[PDB]
Assembly symmetry: D3
Amino acid sequence: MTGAVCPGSFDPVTLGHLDVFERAAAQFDEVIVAVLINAGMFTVDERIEMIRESTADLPNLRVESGQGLLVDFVRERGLNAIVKGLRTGTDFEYELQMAQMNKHIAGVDTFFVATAPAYSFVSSSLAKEVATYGGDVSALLPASVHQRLLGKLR
Amino acid sequence: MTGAVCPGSFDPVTLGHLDVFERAAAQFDEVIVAVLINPAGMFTVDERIEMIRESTADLPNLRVESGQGLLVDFVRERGLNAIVKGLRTGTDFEYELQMAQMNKHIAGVDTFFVATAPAYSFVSSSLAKEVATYGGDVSALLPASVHQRLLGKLR
Amino acid sequence: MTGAVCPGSFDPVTLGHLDVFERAAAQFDEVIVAVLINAGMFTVDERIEMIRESTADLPNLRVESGQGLLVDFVRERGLNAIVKGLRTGTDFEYELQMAQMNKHIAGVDTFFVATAPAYSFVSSSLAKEVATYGGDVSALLPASVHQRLLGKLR
Amino acid sequence: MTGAVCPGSFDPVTLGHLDVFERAAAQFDEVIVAVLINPNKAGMFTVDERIEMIRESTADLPNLRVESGQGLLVDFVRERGLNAIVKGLRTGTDFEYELQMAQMNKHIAGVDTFFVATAPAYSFVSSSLAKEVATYGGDVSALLPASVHQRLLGKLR
Amino acid sequence: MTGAVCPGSFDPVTLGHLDVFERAAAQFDEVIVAVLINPAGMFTVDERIEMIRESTADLPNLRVESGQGLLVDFVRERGLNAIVKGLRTGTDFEYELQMAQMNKHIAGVDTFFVATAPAYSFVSSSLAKEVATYGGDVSALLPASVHQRLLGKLR
Amino acid sequence: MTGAVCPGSFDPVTLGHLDVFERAAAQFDEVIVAVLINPNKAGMFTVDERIEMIRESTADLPNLRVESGQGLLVDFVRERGLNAIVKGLRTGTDFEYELQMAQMNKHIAGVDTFFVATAPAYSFVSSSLAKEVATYGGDVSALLPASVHQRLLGKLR
Ligand SMILES: O=C(O)CCn1ccc2ccccc21
Ligand SMILES: O=C(O)CCn1ccc2ccccc21
Ligand SMILES: O=C(O)CCn1ccc2ccccc21
Ligand SMILES: O=C(O)CCn1ccc2ccccc21
């Protein structure tokens, strides 16, 4: 009965995120991708759809939106583990601070995993920025996502 | 007669801050906590000063004052030339180093850093407010009087 | 059928290590503590005994010695996950390098978890060094370990 | 025919920037200082003021020129027939972000990025910290070229 | 006429090293790879030079030489005053910065750092040898000729 | 009655060390420089040579004294009725290790550790790098006090 939550804004989801989803799904019985909501490029439903489309091959993963404390999202689903990816540019010190806080207030563990080197320099923000000015990020995003991103720009 | 200034916004003061205040007061003849007013937060400057005074009642050589503008001017105006700053998990240490070197260059003021105790190393004013807002229990991370006032602002 | 390997030299095991063991054991069905062998303070068997004594309350954890490639140790037991703790003084850049190498050569994932703040400044080496010169590290080691350490010094 | 681009907002240029310009000009046949502008946020100085302050403090470097631009840095570089960026490191540099951008820039355009550490004396100045300190009266005269300092005080008053 | 020196022990040269060599040769008129002999490794200096030459056959403006003693002397003796060093995962960047500032101070030599490609970012000479020794496959991380010679030393 | 201990091997003392000594002496009533010795590994300089080089370059600091010791730093500190350590930071400092040791020292003995960044000009010198560079003929004269430099060259020849 093992399980972990993979949280983020995923605006949009990248291959970096997808790599981490796949590893979490390979090592825990149950994975929930938690889509944080609050004003980015994609609506929550769009972000959820894009993740669902890219994770179709992952039978034990589902996608849900949430707000408020992440630890509440995790605990309300009977779990107490978070899996978070590391990339180039990750504010790791802040992630550690949040991990220790989350353990303190709710007994939830956080496991960090480095994304694959090939996907280590992509972030949602940098991909949007580059694509905005016409750079090719098609190798860095799921095929579906890439087409829909081009859609919001053009 | 030795002395140091401990600067911050303290909105609100945490046990991380208090740990640092205590270590400074133990090591310098005089300590001034400088509550730095900005372009803004949850507590007023007077409220912040009051919460710090409550938390530091046992420290006779420490006083609390508000300030604005250049930190090194605040320090030198009070006849001192040392700053004591704490380090926690999530501190932007590279920025703190930059500012310390800048402050030494422009005014000859030294900066001493001390790591807060591991128990208080993941608390910050911002994260404590954020967690409390959504109903997380941060009472082990703040002075008792502060936690009481935080509930009040949120209710 | 989930599982992870927790590797180290554990010379001796600390409460920092034990914290990580407990979290791994809480989040995976099966945990194996891998005791690396090659000249420290305790023999391999002693290190193993000390870990077994300190993990008696963890029914799904066992302790075994190993040498050679860690990924071989993991794969030969049907697993492909490593759980590694982070403490103050951890050479994280090196851990990331090894994690990426281990994924490359054998498809093994590495999950990192920060140890509890209270146990974040203890390491096997610093505890031995301090105890050697008479400092009290009894709050930082399992009760059994502490008595046996005093035994090797006196 | 070697060449590199030294990019930044330079609002204003500092002695840390100038140190990097000089090292680049010593090691590449041509250097272009790229004054990159966000058309959606004004800085303290206009583009012409920024360029003027850089030119005045680089008059001794005959193989260096200064041009403004916007959009993708790698397009600025490639349209000039080059494929190298030279970027300085100081105290407070977000090096992880710089590494991310360098890998992305190599990925999308094949442009290389070379980092050089600025001189220790100029290692704690940044445009933003200089402006902030000067705003509140602190003396930053030793950290900025003469072409900048009194123009800065002028903007502030 | 521009130029730079790329120093290291290269025991053995990796694709991480080669990536950096290629970028240097693309950006400077002349590149010298300096194979630095130490108080010791798996390959002799002549073997290391040979492996690098094999791997850099397509780079006409790059040459390979052995050296010892002070790096900045090696650089200045050849009429240059630039060093190009690569960065990978596990690089002790703080030490590299210290050495670059020292090298600038004592001899006026500049150091330019470049990050190796993500694909080659976790390989090092030491980790490649360690993995290969125990039968791990590092052939995607080394030039073909190098991997062939590594097997030989281990067999 | 305030006081701090400035610990190290000082083999030899550098201008980076001296910068830290001076700041400590300016901010505490008394400073003790603790020359910590490993009785199992000789350095380049004997304990008396190390102490002599420090004393000669600190003659202008009347509230500073120099003493050797071994074993636990926190015992050296406490046996002198103090409970503060002042430690410098430079380029190449293993700060994570320093943080680990500071937390351990507070845990076992209640001693506080205060870190100060050394001056930029002295930020890339260390005893070990100075020795290494001097060994191969490099000029480190501007990074060491006069009390040290020719004694170093003497050891090397
Ligand atoms: O970092 C801590 O937890 C307390 C240490 N400290 C001392 C002054 C100060 C100002 C802002 C933030 C932290 C501060
Ligand atoms: O100012 C420094 O210290 C870094 C030197 N540097 C060189 C190019 C550049 C662009 C933006 C910011 C800093 C820059
Ligand atoms: O770091 C890399 O992968 C190659 C970049 N590089 C260039 C010279 C050199 C020397 C030692 C180690 C790495 C080096
Ligand atoms: O040399 C520096 O830059 C750091 C200043 N510092 C002050 C005490 C001390 C002890 C060992 C090493 C360095 C030390």
